[PDB]
Structures are given as structure tokens and as C-alpha cells.
């Protein structure tokens, strides 16, 4: 009926991400249902060349098509996009057993010595979830030196391969650029619209001189919200000071999402509408999702929502995570999220290793819990507590911090990044 497959994607030709976007469409139409996307990888060349760097990924899906039928749809997509060849599609795994034909070694022995194949492969697999992931145990056993796919990766260098002096980098695509949200801590400054246009621009100008990276503009009724957001969105986007800076926008209203994307919003931050998945699917914008036994609860809660999002055509490689600090009505839960960020990632890794590597944004800034712990009932008096909390979260792995006081938190990010530099 349906056989589970894993296909690798590779491109260093044209708009590399357009090729991957196109391949994913033609895969759907020609009878391939993609259930899981890997993270995106940008691989350095291991020899001297003037060629562009490769973008490498992998997908996992169900298909009726037989091996030779499937291979021919991939060869078809390859030629059809080609009218040098833009896009490599390779079958990594078909069903449960090794296939051999004239040219069809599935899985080829090369995949256990290619980090740009193995890293994205690993992301499609959970470390536990054996209950619901029956086919994976077989893939593991097709490894040439045993210990599963996971130990093949480890043999190559595992996660040590990504980072400072890395062969290869996990990257998030934002329009025409690739951002490595793991290379340093990115600081997202809050610009709130209910505490006008001229104040907004001077706020932003100040955040930019304070060291900010990303501007979070957040504003309920579908038109009221368009009327407040879109004008300042337009202005902020045009600012000369905002060249090569990102803008996230905070909404749950698909119509605000669509209008914001159209008007220069780089990241869309949902907090929760089935129209939304569709808006974010047509677009090329990163999709940040917020969370609604704490580690396990947050992991699985998040996972369920990412599985939903992948299935509705939103790859995991442009999905970002906020565990939702300071929505929990209590101290102990908020401290856990910050201090147990690596544990949340293990719990995510159990269902999806890819999601375990997704960039994580924390927003502790002047939340009540800092107040209750430090005796700061005035929000504005909670900045020193916020620097401390943000320093903890970065040390426990956070990649983005959502802050009110840009300068003080930037000083903390710059220091955390110097401290965590391996030396």
C-alpha cells in the first residue's frame, strides 16, 4: 500500500532554497507524501573550488511508488527543474531492507562517512518513540558497523562537527539569506504599540545603537490590529538603520500574519486558527511556535504542534521554539524551563532529534516570577533579575532572548558568548 522512504536533498545551484521548495511541491504532485523535514545544512567544500557551498537536507515520507518508480520520479524532478543540474535527490532508505540494482544501492555505504547526509538523516529520527516508529529499528540495523545510525554520526564527530571551526552549519532560511542562530546569541528587542509612528522609529533607532539584532513588533480584533501594526511595520522596515536587521511580528490572526509578511515581517511569531498554517505555508518566513514531567509536557506538547505543521507543508528547518516562560501562573515552572533547557531538548530528541536542534527563544524579561523571587513588584525594576535569568538561559542553551532593556541584555549575551567559546 504505502512504503516509508527517506530522500536526501542537495543543491549549490541558483537560489538553492527555491530548488528545495520546488522539489517538495513536485514530490507531492508525483505521489510522495512528506511527513518529516530535516534541519537545513550548509556544508563547506573539503577541496579548493570556486563553486557555491551546498545546501543539504533530507525528508521522510510514505509512497505507493516502487523503488524504480520512485527513483524515476526523482530523476524526472531533476530533469524537469533543469529545464548544470540544480538539485540532487537520492533514496537513502526504502522500506525495511537493503535494495541492490544496476544503479540503486539503498542505503549506500557512503552515507555513514558524509556528515551532510548523516546530520540531516539523524534529524528525521526519534531516540525513543519505538512504540510509534516501528520502521526506524530496521534502518538502524542497516548501519555498516552496528550501534545504529546514531553511533555512525558519533563516529564521524556527531554535533562536534557543527560550530566554531565546523565543516557544516545548521541554518534557518529567511528570504534570500541563511542565518546560523547557533553561532552567537541573537537579541530581540520588544517594541510594544499600547503603552506614535515617530516614537516607534526613535525607539528602534535606540535598540539598534544598543546592539539589538531583531525587532519584535506586537499589538483584540482582526482590523484594529492591522491598523496599529502595518503602518509602523512599513516605517521600521524602510529605516536605513534597519538594513540587515530582522523584524518578528507577534500575532494569532492569520489575516494580520498575511498582511505583516506582505509588508516586510521576516519572522512570524504565533501564540496559541487553521487558516494560519496555510498563510505560513505559501510564505518563506520562519514560523516561531509558543508552548501552551514539565520538560516531557513542554517537549511532547511542542512536538505534536510541529508534526501538525510539517504535515500541512511547513518544514521543520524554518520552525523555531519558545517554551513560553512567564505564562505559567507560578515560580517553580518558569525556573525549570530556564535551568532544564537541555533536558527539554532530550525529551524533544525522543520524538524528533531535528526539533532538539531547532533554535530556542526565551522571553523572561520583567515577567512576574522575577518580581516574586527578587521583591520587584514594578516591572521596570526587574531588569537586573532579567539579565541574570537571560545569562542562565544562554548558559543552558537559549539562542534568542526577547528583552525590554536592549543594552543590558546585549552586554550579557556578548559575555555569555565569550564565556561559552571553547578556547
From Swiss-Prot:
The question of whether Zinc is a record keyword is answered with: no
Q: Which residues form the Pterin-binding domain?
A: 185-414
Give the reaction(s) catalysed.
6-hydroxymethyl-7,8-dihydropterin + ATP = (7,8-dihydropterin-6-yl)methyl diphosphate + AMP + H(+); (7,8-dihydropterin-6-yl)methyl diphosphate + 4-aminobenzoate = 7,8-dihydropteroate + diphosphate
The first-level EC class reads transferase
Tissue-level expression reads: Expressed exclusively in reproductive tissues.
The protein's name:
Folate synthesis bifunctional protein
* Gene name, Swiss-Prot/TrEMBL: CytHPPK/DHPS
Pathway(s) of this molecule: Cofactor biosynthesis; tetrahydrofolate biosynthesis; 2-amino-4-hydroxy-6-hydroxymethyl-7,8-dihydropteridine diphosphate from 7,8-dihydroneopterin triphosphate: step 4/4; Cofactor biosynthesis; tetrahydrofolate biosynthesis; 7,8-dihydrofolate from 2-amino-4-hydroxy-6-hydroxymethyl-7,8-dihydropteridine diphosphate and 4-aminobenzoate: step 1/2
Which species? Arabidopsis thaliana
Q: Where is this region: HPPK?
A: 6-124
- One function term, GO molecular function aspect: dihydropteroate synthase activity
Amino acid at each position: 500500500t504505502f512504503e516509508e522512504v527517506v530522500i536526501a536533498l542537495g543543491s549549490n545551484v541558483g537560489n538553492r532554497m527555491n530548488n528545495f521548495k520546488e522539489a517538495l511541491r513536485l514530490m507531492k504532485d508525483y505521489g510522495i507524501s512528506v511527513t518529516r523535514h530535516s534541519c537545513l545544512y550548509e556544508t563547506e567544500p573539503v577541496h579548493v573550488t570556486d563553486q557555491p557551498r551546498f545546501l543539504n537536507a533530507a525528508i521522510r515520507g510514505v509512497t505507493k511508488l516502487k523503488p524504480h518508480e520512485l527513483l524515476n520520479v526523482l530523476k524526472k524532478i531533476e530533469k524537469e527543474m533543469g529545464r548544470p543540474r540544480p538539485l540532487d535527490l537520492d533514496i537513502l532508505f526504502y522500506g525495511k531492507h537493503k535494495i541492490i540494482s544496476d544503479k540503486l544501492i539503498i542505503p549506500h555505504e557512503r552515507i555513514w562517512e558524509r556528515p551532510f547526509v548523516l546530520a540531516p538523516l539523524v534529524d528525521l529520527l526519534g531516540t525513543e518513540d519505538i512504540d510509534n516508529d516501528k520502521i526506524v529499528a530496521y534502518w538502524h540495523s542497516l548501519s555498516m558497523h552496528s550501534g545504529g545510525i546514531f553511533q555512525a554520526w558519533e563516529r564521524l564527530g556527531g554535533e562536534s562537527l557543527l560550530g566554531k571551526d565546523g565543516i557544516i552549519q545548521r541554518v534557518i532560511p529567511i528570504g534570500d539569506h541563511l542565518w546560523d542562530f547557533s553561532k552567537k546569541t541573537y537579541v530581540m528587542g520588544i517594541l510594544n504599540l499600547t503603552p506614535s509612528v515617530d516614537t516607534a522609529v526613535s525607539r528602534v533607532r535606540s535598540m539598534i545603537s544598543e546592539g539589538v539584532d531583531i525587532i519584535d513588533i506586537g499589538a483584540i480584533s482582526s482590523q484594529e490590529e492591522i491598523d496599529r501594526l502595518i503602518p509602523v511595520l512599513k516605517v521600521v522596515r524602510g529605516m536605513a538603520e534597519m538594513k540587515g536587521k530582522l523584524i518578528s511580528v507577534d500575532t494569532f490572526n492569520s489575516e494580520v500574519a498575511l498582511e505583516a509578511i506582505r509588508n516586510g515581517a521576516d519572522i512570524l511569531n504565533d501564540v496559541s486558527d487553521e487558516n494560519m498554517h496555510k498563510v505560513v505555508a505559501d510564505s518563506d518566513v520562519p514560523y516561531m511556535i509558543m508552548h501552551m514531567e514539565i520538560c516531557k509536557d513542554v517537549a511532547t506538547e511542542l512536538y505534536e504542534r510541529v508534526r501538525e505543521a510539517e504535515l500541512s507543508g511547513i518544514p521543520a528547518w524554518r520552525i523555531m521554539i519558545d517554551p513560553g516562560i512567564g505564562f505559567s501562573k507560578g515560580i517553580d515552572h518558569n525556573l525549570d524551563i530556564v535551568m532544564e533547557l537541555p533536558k527539554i531538548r532530550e525529551e524533544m530528541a525522543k520524538k524528533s532529534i531535528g526539533l532538539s536542534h531547532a533554535p530556542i527563544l526565551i522571553g523572561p524579561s520583567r515577567k512576574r516570577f522575577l518580581g516574586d523571587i527578587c521583591g520587584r513588584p514594578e516591572a521596570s525594576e526587574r531588569d537586573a533579575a532579567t539579565v541574570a535569568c537571560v545569562t542562565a538561559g544562554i548558559l543552558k542553551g537559549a539562542n534568542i532572548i526577547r528583552v525590554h532593556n536592549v543594552r543590558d541584555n546585549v552586554d550579557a549575551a556578548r559575555l555569555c558568548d565569550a564565556m561559552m567559546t571553547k578556547r
